[PDB]
């Protein structure tokens, strides 16, 4: 019954002309609720979920002000990093940041996080104890020494354990109709003959929420991984997700195979078998 809130930020420099492209999105579990795009006309934090549109003007003005201050720090960082790595000003680079908090089943603070990356690789991250830092290289080491003297961890720990948890619980209640509801996967199986002696059985899991799910194939009550295929979980586009697993079997022996579906929206796992 745990839940989380997370913010993702991406900044891409554009040496040819202008400022970096900045995009920020907020999520509660697997539901996006806010976004900001430096390329958009509003230049404001915008709603992406109906339950967040309940917040008044002071909320949106405050979030907009903060996300802008966020983009400016990233703009500065891109330049600072370019120097740390002694890189040319002609190429485009990327800085990413992700932070947030988790609440356990008891709805109390469980864990917090604050990680940073440069060009797609770990740069510096705040440890689980929320007091020490993990620096990937010597560029990150200099950043770490500066953040220790300024006591950045302490400031973050206060937010992650307090403000972050408090707002996560508020959002959870305001959007309880969907956020506190699980959507069990709708399942079925398809059969396709690949030859005169072989056939493919595909097990489908549709319209489920949250995204976390496990699909497994068994043959005569035993797990089978050979001759199977599992696609990565994908968004349906309406807030739910999709997944399927397939196995190639000898024509006429389909009944030996069973598809097992595990999901928190299910009291107990589902077992499907072909007619």
């Amino acid at each position: 019954g745990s839940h989380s809130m997370r913010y993702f930020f991406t900044s891409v420099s554009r040496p040819g002309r202008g400022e970096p492209r900045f995009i920020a999105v907020g999520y509660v579990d697997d539901t996006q609720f806010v976004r900001f795009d430096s390329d958009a006309a509003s230049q404001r934090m915008e709603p992406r979920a109906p339950w967040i549109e309940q917040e008044g003007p002071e909320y949106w003005d405050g979030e907009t002000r903060k996300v802008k201050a966020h983009s400016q720090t990233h703009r500065v960082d891109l330049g600072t990093l370019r120097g740390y790595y002694n890189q040319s000003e002609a190429g485009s680079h990327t800085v990413q940041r992700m932070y947030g908090c988790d609440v356990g089943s008891d709805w109390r603070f469980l864990r917090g996080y604050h990680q940073y990356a440069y060009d797609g690789k770990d740069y510096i991250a705040l440890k689980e104890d929320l007091r020490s830092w993990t620096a990937a290289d010597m560029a990150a080491q200099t950043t770490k020494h500066k953040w220790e003297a300024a006591h950045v961890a302490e400031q973050l720990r206060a937010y992650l354990e307090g403000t972050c948890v408090e707002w996560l619980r508020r959002y959870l209640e305001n959007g309880k109709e969907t956020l506190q509801r699980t959507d069990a996967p709708k399942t079925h199986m398809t059969h396709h003959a690949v030859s005169d002696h072989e056939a493919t059985l595909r097990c489908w899991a549709l319209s489920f929420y949250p995204a976390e799910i496990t699909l497994t194939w068994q043959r005569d009550g035993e797990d089978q991984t050979q001759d199977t295929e599992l696609v990565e979980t994908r968004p349906a586009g309406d807030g739910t997700f999709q997944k399927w697993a397939a196995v190639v079997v000898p024509s006429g022996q389909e009944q030996r195979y069973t598809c097992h579906v595990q999901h928190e929206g299910l009291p107990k796992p589902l077992t499907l078998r072909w007619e």
């Binding site: 405050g62 979030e63 201050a69 966020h70 720090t73 950045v152 403000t163």
Partner: peptide, 9 residues
């Protein structure tokens, strides 16, 4: 709700 302060690298 976003964090208020944010230090640079």
């Amino acid at each position: 709700s976003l964090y208020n302060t944010i230090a640079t690298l």
